Design a protein around this motif. Structure first.
Motif, mmCIF file in Angstrom:
data_model
loop_
_atom_site.group_PDB
_atom_site.id
_atom_site.type_symbol
_atom_site.label_atom_id
_atom_site.label_comp_id
_atom_site.label_asym_id
_atom_site.label_seq_id
_atom_site.Cartn_x
_atom_site.Cartn_y
_atom_site.Cartn_z
ATOM 1 N N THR A 138 0.808 -1.209 0.000
ATOM 2 C CA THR A 138 0.000 0.000 0.000
ATOM 3 C C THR A 138 0.849 1.270 0.000
ATOM 4 O O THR A 138 2.077 1.191 0.109
ATOM 5 N N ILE A 139 0.258 2.474 -0.115
ATOM 6 C CA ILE A 139 1.107 3.656 -0.110
ATOM 7 C C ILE A 139 1.693 3.868 1.284
ATOM 8 O O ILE A 139 1.195 3.402 2.317
ATOM 9 N N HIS A 190 4.210 2.288 2.232
ATOM 10 C CA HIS A 190 4.815 1.020 2.630
ATOM 11 C C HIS A 190 5.700 0.495 1.491
ATOM 12 O O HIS A 190 6.025 1.209 0.539
ATOM 13 N N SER A 247 -4.686 -2.831 1.084
ATOM 14 C CA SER A 247 -5.152 -1.465 1.332
ATOM 15 C C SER A 247 -5.229 -0.579 0.088
ATOM 16 O O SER A 247 -6.091 -0.880 -0.716
ATOM 17 N N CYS A 248 -4.454 0.473 -0.209
ATOM 18 C CA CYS A 248 -4.588 1.184 -1.490
ATOM 19 C C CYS A 248 -4.075 0.452 -2.734
ATOM 20 O O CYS A 248 -4.221 0.944 -3.852
ATOM 21 N N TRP A 254 -7.198 10.963 10.586
ATOM 22 C CA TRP A 254 -5.975 10.192 10.435
ATOM 23 C C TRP A 254 -4.977 10.507 11.545
ATOM 24 O O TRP A 254 -3.775 10.286 11.427
ATOM 25 N N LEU A 304 2.179 8.905 7.316
ATOM 26 C CA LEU A 304 1.341 8.258 8.311
ATOM 27 C C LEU A 304 1.866 8.447 9.720
ATOM 28 O O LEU A 304 3.043 8.226 10.028
ATOM 29 N N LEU A 307 -3.593 0.612 11.908
ATOM 30 C CA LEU A 307 -3.056 -0.294 10.907
ATOM 31 C C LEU A 307 -2.436 -1.549 11.490
ATOM 32 O O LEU A 307 -2.714 -2.655 11.040
ATOM 33 N N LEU A 327 -1.921 9.528 -1.895
ATOM 34 C CA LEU A 327 -3.082 8.856 -2.437
ATOM 35 C C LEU A 327 -3.385 9.445 -3.810
ATOM 36 O O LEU A 327 -4.168 8.836 -4.528
ATOM 37 N N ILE A 363 -9.049 0.645 10.251
ATOM 38 C CA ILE A 363 -9.011 1.824 9.380
ATOM 39 C C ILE A 363 -10.083 1.596 8.322
ATOM 40 O O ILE A 363 -10.891 2.486 8.063
ATOM 41 N N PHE A 364 -10.036 0.441 7.632
ATOM 42 C CA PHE A 364 -11.036 0.108 6.621
ATOM 43 C C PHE A 364 -12.087 -0.675 7.369
ATOM 44 O O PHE A 364 -12.141 -1.902 7.402
ATOM 45 N N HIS A 371 -5.824 -4.813 10.291
ATOM 46 C CA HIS A 371 -5.660 -4.358 8.922
ATOM 47 C C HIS A 371 -4.493 -5.041 8.209
ATOM 48 O O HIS A 371 -4.545 -5.258 7.004
HETATM 49 O O1 LIG Z 1 -3.084 2.223 3.262
HETATM 50 C C1 LIG Z 1 -2.687 3.256 4.150
HETATM 51 O O2 LIG Z 1 -1.341 2.991 4.541
HETATM 52 C C2 LIG Z 1 -2.708 4.523 3.343
HETATM 53 F F1 LIG Z 1 -1.791 4.293 2.413
HETATM 54 F F2 LIG Z 1 -3.938 4.754 2.749
HETATM 55 F F3 LIG Z 1 -2.313 5.603 4.079
HETATM 56 C C3 LIG Z 1 -3.573 3.291 5.379
HETATM 57 F F4 LIG Z 1 -3.697 2.021 5.842
HETATM 58 F F5 LIG Z 1 -2.963 4.079 6.323
HETATM 59 F F6 LIG Z 1 -4.831 3.772 5.078
#
Ligand SMILES: OC(O)(C(F)(F)F)C(F)(F)F
Length: 256
Positions: A10-11, A13, A79-80, A127, A147, A156, A177, A208-209, A234
């Protein structure tokens, strides 16, 4: 059966969140590729060089371009990461046996690319200690974020060990994002993205989700298969690694 899984972080990461899942899938006989996307993990670029989710997805698109004719992979996005899957499927649908969404955004073809992200910001608006910045790339102002460590700890990595949360504080980077860029992007197509098999994995314990967002996405764009993992958080590839590997073995045995 054995499959070639391409794991997509995901973003903010990198490939590193898959460090527990990738040896488990290999111990089942599978080939596994864990990519760093642009300006992510140990990729050399910084996020201010990236102007869109499509440019951010370049490592995945270059990887798929390098697959020889007839080689198919199962994409797994967390995630994203679902948005990188949608971008890749519109260029390389023939090379994708299936896509697995892991507590992930599920874009559709009837609304704009940002739709699911616009709904995520409504369901999860605070957030916490996440910080924001802006930069300009190709005449567009993009909101970057980093983050917050308390968001990392509580939402998360809720149930992850202190050594896993330590890796997140050490390795998470500035990302974006690219929401305003996604809003003006052409829609994901019915013939590319719409044609691939989509397996939706999630936990109702995600902080988060949240269940309202994930159940909202399942009703919005019906997955071919839905797996609900009990417990975890998550980051199911860290708290429920074994369970994710069993689900991925089943996907490998179902989608060719
Ligand atoms: O995926 C996330 O890391 C983000 F990238 F959207 F920030 C989250 F989990 F924090 F939402």
């Amino acid at each position: 059966a054995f499959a070639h899984f391409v794991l997509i972080h995901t973003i903010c990461h990198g490939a590193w969140i898959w460090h527990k899942l990738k040896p488990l899938l290999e111990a089942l006989g599978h080939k596994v590729t864990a990519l760093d996307l642009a300006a992510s993990g140990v990729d050399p670029r910084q996020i201010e060089e990236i102007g869109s989710f499509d440019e951010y997805s370049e490592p995945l698109l270059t990887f798929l371009e390098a697959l020889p004719p007839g080689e198919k992979v199962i994409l797994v996005g967390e995630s994203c990461g679902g948005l990188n899957i949608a971008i890749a499927a519109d260029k390389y649908c023939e090379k994708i046996a299936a896509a697995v969404f892991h507590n992930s955004v599920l874009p559709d073809t009837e609304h704009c690319p940002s739709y699911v992200v616009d709904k995520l910001m409504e369901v999860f608006p605070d957030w916490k200690d996440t910080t924001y910045f802006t930069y300009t790339k190709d005449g567009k102002e993009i909101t970057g974020l980093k983050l917050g460590f308390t968001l990392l700890r509580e939402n998360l990595y809720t149930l992850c060990g202190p050594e896993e949360y330590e890796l997140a504080k050490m390795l998470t980077r500035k990302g974006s994002l690219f929401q305003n860029i996604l809003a003006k992007r052409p829609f994901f197509t019915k013939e590319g993205y719409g044609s691939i098999k989509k397996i939706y994995v999630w936990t109702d314990q995600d902080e988060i989700f949240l269940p309202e967002f994930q159940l909202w996405q399942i009703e919005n764009y019906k997955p071919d298969k839905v797996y609900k993992v009990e417990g975890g958080d998550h980051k199911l590839q860290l708290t429920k690694t074994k369970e994710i590997a069993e689900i991925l073995q089943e996907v490998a045995d179902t989608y060719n």
